[PDB]
Amino acid sequence: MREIVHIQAGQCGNQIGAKFWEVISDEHGIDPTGSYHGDSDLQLERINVYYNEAAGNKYVPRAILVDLEPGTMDSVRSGPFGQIFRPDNFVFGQSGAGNNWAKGHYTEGAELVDSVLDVVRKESESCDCLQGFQLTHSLGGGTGSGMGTLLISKIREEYPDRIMNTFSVVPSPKVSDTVVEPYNATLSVHQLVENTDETYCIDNEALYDICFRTLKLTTPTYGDLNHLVSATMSGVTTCLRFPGQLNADLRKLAVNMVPFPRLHFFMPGFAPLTSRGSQQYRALTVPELTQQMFDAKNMMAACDPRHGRYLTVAAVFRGRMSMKEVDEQMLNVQNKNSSYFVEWIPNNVKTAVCDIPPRGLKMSATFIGNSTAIQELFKRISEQFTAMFRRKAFLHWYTGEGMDEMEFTEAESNMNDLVSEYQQYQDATA
Amino acid sequence: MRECISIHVGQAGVQIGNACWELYCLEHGIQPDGQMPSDSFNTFFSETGAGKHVPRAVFVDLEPTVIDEVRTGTYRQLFHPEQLITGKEDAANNYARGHYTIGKEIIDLVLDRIRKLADQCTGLQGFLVFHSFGGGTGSGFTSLLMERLSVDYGKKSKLEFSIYPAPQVSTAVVEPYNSILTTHTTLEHSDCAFMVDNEAIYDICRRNLDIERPTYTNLNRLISQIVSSITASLRFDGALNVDLTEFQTNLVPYPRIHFPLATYAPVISAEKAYHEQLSVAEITNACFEPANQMVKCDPRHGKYMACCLLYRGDVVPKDVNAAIATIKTKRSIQFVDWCPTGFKVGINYQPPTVVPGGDLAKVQRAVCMLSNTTAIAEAWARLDHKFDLMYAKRAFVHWYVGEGMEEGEFSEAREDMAALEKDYEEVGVDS
Amino acid sequence: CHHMKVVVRVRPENTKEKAAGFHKVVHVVDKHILVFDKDLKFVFDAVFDETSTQSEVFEHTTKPILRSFLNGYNCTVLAYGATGAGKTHTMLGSADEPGVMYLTMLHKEEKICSTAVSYLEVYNEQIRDLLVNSGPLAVREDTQKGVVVHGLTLHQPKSSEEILHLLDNGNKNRTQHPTSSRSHAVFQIYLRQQDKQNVRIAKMSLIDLAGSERASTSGAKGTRFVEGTNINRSLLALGNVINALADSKRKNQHIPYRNSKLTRLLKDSLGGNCQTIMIAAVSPSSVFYDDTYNTLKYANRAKDIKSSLKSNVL
Ligand SMILES: CC(=O)O[C@H]1C(=O)[C@@]2(C)[C@H]([C@H](OC(=O)c3ccccc3)[C@]3(O)C[C@H](OC(=O)[C@H](O)[C@@H](NC(=O)c4ccccc4)c4ccccc4)C(C)=C1C3(C)C)[C@]1(OC(C)=O)CO[C@@H]1C[C@@H]2O
Ligand SMILES: Nc1nc2c(ncn2[C@@H]2O[C@H](COP(=O)(O)OP(=O)(O)OP(=O)(O)O)[C@@H](O)[C@H]2O)c(=O)[nH]1
Ligand SMILES: Nc1nc2c(ncn2[C@@H]2O[C@H](COP(=O)(O)OP(=O)(O)O)[C@@H](O)[C@H]2O)c(=O)[nH]1
Ligand SMILES: Nc1ncnc2c1ncn2[C@@H]1O[C@H](COP(=O)(O)OP(=O)(O)O)[C@@H](O)[C@H]1O
Ligand SMILES: [Mg+2]
Ligand SMILES: [Mg+2]
């Protein structure tokens, strides 16, 4: 019925996609070889949302592997759960963007886009009722950001009535992993604002903070961060695969969480998260999940929701619970924090309950918050861009691929307008 | 004889209907697979072939999850396969999607199935429609379906069992839009509309039954008890019988005021059952308590217009008369000036049945009340204020506009609701 | 200087509907007062009816704007009406020739006047050039200037019939009922006044909007519906911008221009920097009933108070 096509571009996108597919395959009981060895019928009841049935009791994920360099997907293929993917969906070039948005959007991506779109069309026509797409990438690299934005624009042109989801790793506020991340981030937000239905913003620094403070992990690696992102993705898409007492798909969340077209940048979160030693000292109840969800330190983006006001909030519970408890918890949260929710929207919180819990835990929840405190990320990126752009530093790398300064000015002005809108919608005027 | 067709649309309607049909099969001795192991139950079932009973129901939804749950569950062999109708993509909390875009590909199929069901009928007198205001498919497809049925049938009564939005408790952000739009469209196509509030059911379950975790099953069981009490006059014989026409001719004084409130008594747990000698006067009195009301509104803020009392079990007419006279002489509850005789009483014989695993005791007598009161004007005012707040800045409007709805429909619906508010305020002035 | 004039052109009754058992829901009194049906009171500057011909609306539509469109940023004439009212007829049949081919001869003693014109349409949230066959164009913003359509074609007629040739070729390339759901056609005139001084910036903007459709109640699915509802969302964005440009004393704030390509083109023309006048068309029949009195009519009251500026004689 409602089915999803997955696309991942670049090094970070590829790694997050690999972790996410291992997670989902273990959730639906599919071995590395692709055969089914589960123990419930609900696992195979809605397998078609993410998988294609192959010959001989085999399941092939509906994923596209895109990269401008071959090493990352070579490692992905040679690793575990690397034989589960269809080899024809590995689409790679040979040159690479080199941390250049122009190279990934106008020089190499302009050459790989035809092949990637042919693969995407072949995957999408075989769908029975396409629900939407889903892109995993970042905003600080060349191939990831540039090719992801190009693919998003092309898909929006081809399929304008569908749902486009993005899980983009926005640049970190404190330490920068690339000298030219402001340029790429601005030029990619310029396209995300227009061509994306809803965008989930995640920061690596917030993930480190979660892994060091809540999980008490002494030495967190990128595997843990990809694990957290995979958990968030599965929690977001859980209602399409399992029955529930009150269910909401992607389009319902988009309708309930996006009041105006240009405001679709959310911050995600997960609960419960605890250390190994502290699990004996806590009780898993709906109030505890609700308390942990609405925590500043639990957010997956480096923004503090207490600096602004929530527009809308979505919580997707999983497990066996009572709707009365969930509803009174939402009411209590709304009434206690009346200064942190917008006045001109009553009942800021949307709710959904899924019957089947994550493997292991008996309870879980997912948080999606559309807050006006996300303007700080855009404001910081705009400040860095306009500081580096007056001196025209590192600009010739971008203008040697045909890009002209009018595009930079347009992107900066669009980002400034988005910041102004988010700031202005903190005023009730009533 | 005389039969009734039940229509369940949306997730709320489908689940409520599942509970109601489990209760109905339990009442008449029908096994979950339809067979009778051992004939006044044909007003809801039909004899097919060699001793199989098929309910006269149609299950409609725009997504396959809950209808598939029904198709796989223990009652998979009770319903006709073609009566569980399923779409592909739900309305996603959008009135425009359900009414204009997604409902138009299965409306013809649903109407054809309804016609096929009613043709087999020989004394059809009404439809029962279960839905919720806040949903997308619920509100939209219910409005479209009632418009089509009113065009097609016209004289047959059309009752409603809807889930009114709660004053504070909510599970969606765009609820006021859908509620206002569906009310505006449906106001001229429904003969009656009984409503309950989920928040009030939570309160009743927490207080009366002493349950701290009342999932949707308990609410659906309470609503099933209400519907069973309403239709027992049809299915069983009694001292006084009430049809589907008497409800509309007694509870609806004006064509735009057809929103009664449904309560039930006694809702008690088996711990307090052994210590209480429940009798006609006590349950009749309990039907009037503001805390026992099943919609989150205070009847003391308005004036009663017409009340229907449905007794079943070990109930004597003289005790009913005495209890009603006692209620009438009470000065704390008010009736409108132009309704000197405002009671309709029906007395049945079959006591309410107990569903194993339920949270209710076994009682020898029970009461179901349906009352028309002006205390719902406050609920209308609250809904209109929410609509006005969310609409002044045109929030979420683009979602509806992109699915085929013009901007004028919001203004039309708001003006219609204002007119309804003025009508409710004018009907309650003494003269 | 500030009054955004709103004129209502009451269309003559349709020939097929006139005798088919309908009444008139719009009653005309004179050129200053109008009455609806219930019995609502409406005043919209000048009011026209079936008696006035195509050229008879010139007296209160474009003539006391285009006296000499140099002292101000001047014309931003829109055309509401929705389907079947006659906005496209009124604009593109006659009442655009009074603008040019009828007001190209205006004196030369104090100035030397030359013009530059361009034509574009907005279809499916994309911009196309109607005079030359070119693909979608990109709108670029900047602090110094306004919005500029990257790739538009500029033309400088040096006579009068050149404008009629350009206009005639600008309508056969419009997406003409694949009248029905269509594209918003924008005509831009640039006035040059080289002195025989540097007071030469003026631009005249003429817009012929599309109509809002109800789809399922009156319309279709597939195409004519995907190409539809883009008109609806663009009109919603335009209405939001208009409402935000005339709200009480707050005004200012943040006006959501970027929600559509149509409103971006009007960033420098819908705000208060020019003398602008609106035209709306309404059908007096009762078959439409509701769509004739809504943001078609209620909203134009809110756009009679769009305070503007004209001191910038540039
Ligand atoms: C003693 C014990 O049994 O521990 C559990 C466990 O549940 C705990 C400790 C887990 C554990 O998680 C971690 O320790 C962890 C470390 C780094 C990064 C992220 C997590 C666990 O890994 C998590 C894992 O849970 C799952 O398997 C979930 O289904 C999870 N899937 C995976 O983790 C997974 C990993 C590889 C391959 C396939 C699946 C999941 C979560 C969300 C959505 C879908 C699936 C299990 C049972 C445990 C350990 C092993 C310690 C916790 O995590 C989650 C996601 O539930 C830590 O905070 C919770 C608290 C839990 O009690
Ligand atoms: N009493 C009761 N109410 C329910 C039940 N299920 C859903 N609801 C109500 O329905 C509201 C949510 O909207 P739905 O009725 O589920 O909408 P829908 O029918 O699924 O249609 P969509 O909006 O397209 O998903 C909630 O606010 C609940 O109050 C139920 O089983 N019992
Ligand atoms: N070479 C390369 N580097 C990237 C790309 N995208 C992002 N990066 C950089 O990689 C950093 C983190 O990415 P990564 O560690 O792979 O993401 P994670 O493992 O999921 O947390 C970011 O700060 C980016 O600067 C890309 O496409 N190619
Ligand atoms: N003053 C008028 N006299 C006669 N017919 C008119 C008048 N104004 C408009 N019409 C008719 O109304 C119709 C409206 O169509 P048109 O203006 O081309 O597109 P739209 O319906 O989108 O405005 C035209 O076909 C035209 O014949
Ligand atoms: Mg549903
Ligand atoms: Mg036209």
Numbering used by the authors:
A (entry chain K): 1 to 430
B (entry chain L): 1 to 38, 47 to 439
C (entry chain A): 9 to 45, 70 to 139, 148 to 218, 224 to 241, 247 to 364
Which of the paper's sentences describe this entry?
The dynamics of kinetochore-attached microtubules are regulated by hepatoma-upregulated protein (HURP) and the mitotic kinesin-8 Kif18A, but the underlying mechanism remains elusive. Hepatoma-upregulated protein (HURP) is a spindle assembly factor that localizes to the chromatin-proximal region of K-fibers in a process mediated by Ran-GTP signaling. Through its stabilizing and bundling activities, HURP regulates K-fiber dynamics and spindle morphology, contributing to chromosomal movements and alignment. K-fibers also recruit Kif18A, a member of the kinesin-8 family that walks towards and accumulates at the plus-ends of K-microtubules.
To directly determine whether HURP and Kif18A exclude each other on microtubules, we determined the structure of microtubules co-decorated with HURP1-285 and Kif18A1-373. To increase the likelihood of these proteins occupying the same or adjacent tubulins, we decorated taxol-stabilized microtubules with equimolar and near-saturating concentrations of HURP and Kif18A. The first class contained density for tubulin and HURP (~40% of the particles, 3.0 Å), the second class featured tubulin and Kif18A (~39% of the particles, 3.1 Å), while the third class showed tubulin density only (~21% of the particles, 3.5 Å). For the Kif18A-containing class, we were able to build a model and visualize kinesin-tubulin interactions. This result further confirms an antagonistic binding mode, where the presence of the motor domain of Kif18A is incompatible with HURP’s MTBD1 engaging the microtubule, since the motor displaced both the α-helix and the groove-binding loop of HURP from tubulin. Our microtubule-bound structure of Kif18A provides insight into the nucleotide-dependent conformation and depolymerizing activity of Kif18A. A sequence alignment of loop 2 shows that key residues interacting with α-tubulin in C. Albicans Kip3 have diverged in the human homolog, highlighting how sequence divergence in this region could be driving differences in the mechanism and function of kinesin-8 motors across species.
